[PDB]
């Protein structure tokens, strides 16, 4: 029956599209340990400036 045959293709595409979204978002999730460093340097610079003020 051509009805369920067309639906089976959209169900396959739906199961692919959610899994592609998981893969793209997992690649962004792995970047979190790199994007963290610029904030860590600002905390270092803040404590350096405060330390110089205490000196």
């Amino acid at each position: 029956s051509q009805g369920i045959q067309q639906l089976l293709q959209a169900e396959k595409r739906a199961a692919e599209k959610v899994s592609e979204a998981r893969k793209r978002k997992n690649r962004r999730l792995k970047q979190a340990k790199e994007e963290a460093q610029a904030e860590i340097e600002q905390y270092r610079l803040q404590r350096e400036k405060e330390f110089k003020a205490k000196e």
């Binding site: 029956s1 009805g3 369920i4 639906l7 089976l8 169900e11 396959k12 739906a14 199961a15």
Partner: protein
């Protein structure tokens, strides 16, 4: 319309998997629908909903357990109202916890009732033991035993404690109730005295041997009195806790008796839905569902509305559409029923289930079965008895519907009550026209027969002299005879010695005529069946040569019978021809040119023409039907061999089988003669003996003789020959009527429904 199998269609359903549970629920609530299986891999561990169905099977086993425990307590189950299904989410977890709660609470409250009731009895026995024992190293025991065991008990004590036991006993002020069985037992207290533990072991072993119970008691009257005040306090505390335990038991059992109705409905609806969902097909990439169903043609829209409601009762938006299928397998078979027609349909379905749109035998059966039966059963006396029985069951209907069903015989005859009434009523009708009540006439009919003065006319007048000395025959000649007669059988034919010759001529010819008529109706129903299937070949090469074969034999046989009954009379009786001999001579093309005369002018030519035309019909049924069918399936580019074998066997039955079936209807006559003569002898050597020349002896004799007659008449005729005529009337009906037209091959309509809960 109910003369044929009701119209249906197969449909294909597109189902979203969240709507699907609610969709199936609404379809089973509607209950007009039967699913087609699309999952050949279905099995206990392979069915898509393994855990959900397995969990529903366990909840049904748990339901049966809690219901049985409430029924063991004699508490009535609620047995009223109706409820919705459980939602698709895992709310079954709380229902399983409710079954575990009721199971544990039932096991707990059984344990607590037994423990408190057992302790209450044990303390009551201890009260009676102390009351008697208060009247009295050293050692002693005291206890309780059934009073009838005492003589063997004291003898055995004196055997084991050789020649030396001081003891006493007394009966308790009332018998005591058994904690398990509720029996009341005439127990007696006893006390036994000795020295040392060696004798304690012997007396205790014998107490256990007689199933007696020992209890601890103090060494002095003063301490026994203090212990008795303790026991009185304990019995009142035990009674208080026993009353509280009964109040808690009543709460638990009555709460369960209410809940069991709701839980039965919920578990049955869930099991049904999940079982029906396993019939769906699921491919490797699939997330939605596809299914198919058969439904009545009137309700293919009703299933689509049930699907729409199933979606609307769910979070999913998909309306769940369907289409009407074209390349269909043969749909299931159904017809409507009511109080009267239900029994008549059951006796059809038990013999076979029609093909789709096939003629239904049941509407014709409503009369035809009662008619064949009443021809077999046509005694006016038994007609009254059968009517009174069936009327009693109909009048008491609303009472009998509340009574026991475990008597399957009583339930079966009550389920037959309306069909049994109609066959009984027709047995009055046939009994009146046959003019037989208990092998006696009704005097309401006039006389065709001749009074003695009619013989004085010189013609046969020796009757008037010979009748004073010897047996004599009425010749029925004109001027002597009363002429044509408008009533049933003349009353004279019950008292006459030759009656059975005349009455068998009637029942024999009647059985032939009715059988011929029913076969002619059966082929006429075959035409309607072939018209309803719209098949030209089945009519033209089937029905036409079939009815011409039948009519060319049967019409002549009936014409001859009716002609003799019009053209011949008493003065023509000498050298009158034989009907059966003319029929066989016709069939054989063999009038003997001698002896019995021809019945009418040109008859030899007519006989030859009729049998030749019948014999010319047979080849069309045998071969021309198969050959035209072969050319049709060869042009459309089916086996000719199998078709020829099937159609050959069918044609033999449609021809030579129908000749034999004319004789098969002689079962009518046969059963009627047996019934009549069984009744005759039961009169002749019972009722006749009760008549006597004195009032007291006659009245007493008649009472007992007729009571014996009634008992035998019921057992032999109303029960046993009743069942015989019932089955034979149906035999003729199922075979030598229905086999002409009812194909009786098909699936029973068994819709998936909550109405089976």
């Amino acid at each position: 319309e109910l003369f044929r199998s009701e119209e249906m269609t197969l449909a294909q359903l597109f189902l979203q998997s969240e709507a699907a549970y609610c969709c199936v629920s609404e379809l089973e609530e509607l209950g007009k629908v039967q699913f087609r299986d699309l999952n050949p891999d279905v099995n206990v561990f392979q069915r898509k909903f393994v855990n959900e169905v397995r969990r529903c099977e366990e909840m049904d086993r748990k339901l049966r357990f809690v219901e049985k425990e409430i029924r063991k307590a004699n508490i009535p189950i609620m047995d009223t109202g109706e409820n919705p299904e459980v939602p698709f989410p895992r709310d079954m977890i709380d229902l399983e916890a409710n079954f575990e709660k009721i199971e544990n609470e039932l096991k707990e409250i059984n344990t607590n009732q037994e423990a408190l009731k057992r302790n209450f009895l044990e303390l009551t026995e201890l009260k009676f033991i102390l009351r008697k024992t208060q009247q009295f190293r050293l050692g002693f025991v005291a206890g309780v035993i059934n009073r009838e065991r005492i003589p063997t008990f004291e003898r055995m004590l004196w055997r084991v404690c050789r020649g030396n036991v001081f003891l006493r006993q007394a009966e308790i002020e009332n018998p005591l109730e058994d904690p398990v069985t509720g029996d009341y037992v005439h127990k007696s207290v006893f006390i036994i005295f000795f020295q040392g533990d060696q004798l304690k072991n012997r007396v205790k072993k014998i107490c256990e041997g007689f199933r007696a119970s020992l209890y601890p008691c103090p060494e002095t009257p003063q301490e026994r009195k203090e212990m008795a005040s303790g026991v009185n306090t304990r019995i009142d505390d035990l009674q208080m806790v026993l009353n509280q335990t009964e109040d808690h038991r009543q709460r638990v059992l009555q709460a369960a008796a209410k809940n069991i109705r709701v839980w039965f409905i919920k578990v049955r609806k869930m099991k049904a839905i999940y079982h029906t969902l396993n019939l769906c097909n699921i491919d490797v990439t699939q997330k939605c569902l596809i299914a198919e169903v058969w439904c009545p043609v009137t309700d293919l829209d009703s299933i689509q509305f049930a699907l729409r409601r199933g979606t609307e009762h769910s979070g999913s938006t998909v309306p769940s559409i369907l289409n009407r299928m074209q390349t269909n397998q043969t749909p299931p078979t159904y017809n409507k029923t009511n109080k009267f027609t239900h029994g008549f349909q059951n006796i059809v379905d038990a013999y076979g289930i029609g093909t789709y749109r096939e003629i239904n035998p049941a509407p014709y059966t409503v009369i035809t079965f009662p008619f064949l039966f009443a021809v077999m059963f046509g005694d006016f006396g038994h007609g009254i008895l059968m009517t009174l029985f069936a009327v009693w069951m109909v009048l008491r209907e609303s009472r009998i519907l509340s009574q026991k069903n475990e008597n399957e015989m009583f339930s079966m005859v009550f389920s037959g009550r309306y069909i049994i009434l109609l066959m009984g009523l027709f047995s009055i009708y046939t009994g009146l026209i046959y003019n037989d009540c208990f092998s006696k006439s009704l005097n309401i009919f006039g006389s065709s027969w001749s009074v003695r003065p009619m013989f004085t006319i010189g013609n046969w007048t020796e009757e008037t002299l010979l009748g004073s000395s010897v047996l004599q025959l009425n010749p029925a000649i004109p001027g002597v005879f009363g002429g044509p007669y408008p009533f049933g059988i003349d009353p004279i034919w019950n008292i006459a010695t030759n009656k059975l010759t005349f009455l068998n001529s009637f029942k024999m010819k009647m059985s032939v005529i009715l059988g011929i008529i029913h076969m002619l109706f059966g082929v006429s129903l075959s035409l309607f069946n072939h018209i309803y299937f719209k098949k030209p070949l089945n009519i033209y090469f089937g029905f036409i040569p079939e009815i011409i074969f039948m009519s060319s034999l049967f019409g002549y046989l009936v014409i001859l019978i009716f002609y003799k009954w019009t053209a011949y009379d008493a003065h023509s009786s000498r050298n009158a021809p034989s009907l059966l001999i003319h029929f066989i001579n016709m069939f054989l093309f063999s009038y003997p040119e001698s002896g019995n005369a021809m019945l009418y002018s040109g008859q030899k030519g007519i006989q030859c023409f009729l049998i030749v035309v019948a014999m010319l019909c047979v080849p069309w049924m045998l071969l021309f039907k198969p050959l035209i069918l072969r050319h049709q399936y060869l042009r459309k580019k089916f086996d000719f061999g199998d078709t020829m074998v099937h159609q050959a066997i069918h044609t033999i039955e449609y021809c030579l089988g129908c000749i034999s079936n004319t004789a098969s209807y002689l079962r009518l006559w046969a059963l009627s003669l047996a019934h009549a003569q069984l009744s005759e002898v039961l009169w002749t050597m019972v009722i006749h003996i009760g008549l006597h020349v004195r009032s007291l002896a006659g009245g007493l004799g008649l009472f007992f003789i007729f009571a014996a007659f009634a008992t035998l008449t019921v057992a032999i005729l109303l029960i046993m020959e009743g069942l015989s005529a019932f089955l034979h009337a149906l035999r003729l009906h199922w075979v030598e009527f229905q086999n002409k037209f009812y194909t009786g091959t098909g699936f029973k309509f068994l819709p998936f429904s909550f109405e089976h809960i």
